[PDB]
Symmetry: C2
């Protein structure tokens, strides 16, 4: 009957929560969270640009509210995220005098931030996304702000997990990335985890972001990924699951701000890229059902290798996929609709465990 109850024997079944769920303002959603989920990940309020926006300033207010909220409702608290190239202010990568950070100054900035964030929520937050999205599509390290300023991809990852181990020794430490099903990217993640383990550094599991669609990815890629990770003696998790149903975006995951271009808001593109403003049609609503069904059928079959599955939101209006990568669209990615009612996709998902 309930998502967390039906999947109780398999894995934790969680969701992302925004400020409005945590504040109580979104009453309808917060009610669904307590009913259906046993893990919460703070959508945004734990990122570095909210936590330490400028030099000399801190803001833990919203994150403190999130942690307290989860404990109150008995949730498996997941912090997200400690070290990430996006949503991290310019001052993290420069000295007070404007100079780009030396390898030592960059790691000190990493150490201090982890100690500030993870060290604050010891015993309260159970799991940390330590490094988020550092591997490229070819499997190598991404030339990101962190990687450039430190100077070595292996060094960035290795230190972040060691700092998290020091300042939150109680907490599980996860690597989290998108397109973790891609063979070339997968082999890179394995490589990185294997260097962490032989270094003696702690890492509890790899999180597959699961930001997928109707026509991607293949179950082969997903299964082969879950296998490849579990074989390294670490947990596997689907951490931010949603199913994009709109044109173009259902075909593959898009990054960057190219789709945010002014030109795609023009009528001819508006009328193609956002075709479901009046509502989701019977057949596409059925597709979304079948797609969720086959994926959870996979997760439940592989239940021994998966510690947690989380949807990146409760109701469709909450979703980041309405305004990303194309602002102003009406997407239908999650398991509950805009009236907070169950979607025919949910009924299938709850059926999977007993099926």
């Amino acid at each position: 009957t309930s998502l967390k109850q039906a999947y109780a024997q398999g894995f934790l079944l969680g969701t992302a929560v925004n400020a409005d769920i945590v504040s109580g303002k979104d009453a309808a959603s917060a009610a669904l969270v307590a009913c259906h989920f046993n893990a919460v990940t703070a959508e945004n309020v734990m990122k570095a640009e909210v936590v330490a926006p400028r030099r000399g300033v801190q803001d833990f207010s919203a994150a403190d509210a999130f942690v307290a909220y989860a404990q109150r409702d008995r949730q498996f608290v997941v912090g997200h995220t400690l070290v990430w190239h996006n949503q991290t202010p310019e001052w993290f990568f420069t000295t007070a005098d404007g100079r780009p950070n030396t390898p030592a100054q960059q790691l000190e900035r990493m150490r201090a931030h982890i100690a500030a964030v993870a060290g604050r929520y010891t015993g309260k937050v159970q799991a940390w996304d330590v490094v988020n999205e550092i591997i490229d599509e070819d499997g190598s390290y991404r030339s990101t702000n962190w990687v450039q300023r430190v100077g070595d991809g292996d060094t960035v990852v290795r230190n972040a997990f060691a700092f998290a181990q020091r300042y939150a020794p109680d907490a599980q430490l996860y690597y989290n990335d998108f397109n973790a099903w891609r063979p070339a990217k997968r082999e890179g993640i394995v490589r990185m985890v294997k260097m962490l383990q032989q270094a003696g550094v702690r890492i509890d599991g790899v999180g597959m972001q699961g930001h997928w669609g109707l026509n991607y990815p293949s179950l082969r890629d997903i299964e082969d990924a879950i296998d490849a990770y579990a074989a390294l003696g670490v947990k596997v998790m689907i951490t931010e699951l949603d199913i994009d149903v709109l044109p173009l975006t259902k075909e593959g995951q898009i990054i960057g701000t190219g789709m945010a271009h002014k030109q795609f808001q023009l009528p001819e593109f508006k009328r193609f890229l956002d075709p479901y403003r009046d509502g989701l049609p019977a057949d596409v609503q059925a597709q979304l059902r079948d797609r969720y069904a086959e994926l959870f059928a996979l997760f439940w079959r592989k239940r021994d290798k998966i510690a947690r599955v989380s949807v990146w939101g409760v109701s469709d209006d909450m979703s980041w996929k309405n305004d990303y990568p194309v602002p102003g669209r009406t997407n239908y990615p999650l398991l509950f609709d805009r009236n907070h009612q169950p979607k025919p996709a949910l009924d299938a998902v709850v059926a999977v465990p007993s099926a």
Copy 2:
């Protein structure tokens, strides 16, 4: 029967020719040009970066070849682009000592360039795209390198067409743009033409580029566009016609370098964006045939207000739409295939003026 022959009593029927058709290397295309087309536009060799690559340097050799090429069949010679924000080197907009040009210094660079290009081809070039793409989608002037350096949008167009009139008095002067079917942009062009007419500056025609697709734009928007430009007393032309048949880009025209991102080369996107890597399926060929048919039917119904319909190439294999907006794709935009055979669309286009 040929295109020019069928469309003789309606408008000139032209094509874009590359350096290869001109050099005689692409002889297969060359023969089709001599066969079907009575007007020609150089695809690239007359643009700024070619004819004036560096400060104090000129390369008119490849353009010279294009004009000489156009003599053997006596085509209507269209010079492609005098003032345009793209394919124009950054030295055009700066002094020798690095500083950005003053309004007066930028207008001089315009004058000296036009004199060198348009003045060089008097009696030989019949028409000029004087200004290419200056109006934005909302109708206002684009904040281009020319516009910023001159300081004002109206001054760019006013001077460009004035200098063109001076150094090429014989030539017909056009404004050329994409999306020229869009109401907001249409009004911006109409506004711009009116301003030129009130200032007594010469302008002869509005060219709708016509880089279109299967799902865009509506015949109505095209028709309202033709009507509006004709009521100004100028000539209307379809200047760079092609029909995009591949996903996403059959829905609307894309500009910029967004789709040049590594991510659209990844297997899941190439799968979606490039589905016809071994010929067009039957259902889509007919869709292209039907698209070209209904469009040329419009042009022919509105032939009195139209002066020229130019397709932007001969055979698909050299079409810019293959590598733009997404590189490494196989597109089918034109009227002849990669073996220079007539595509079903050609026969539909040729039949249009005879159709009952």
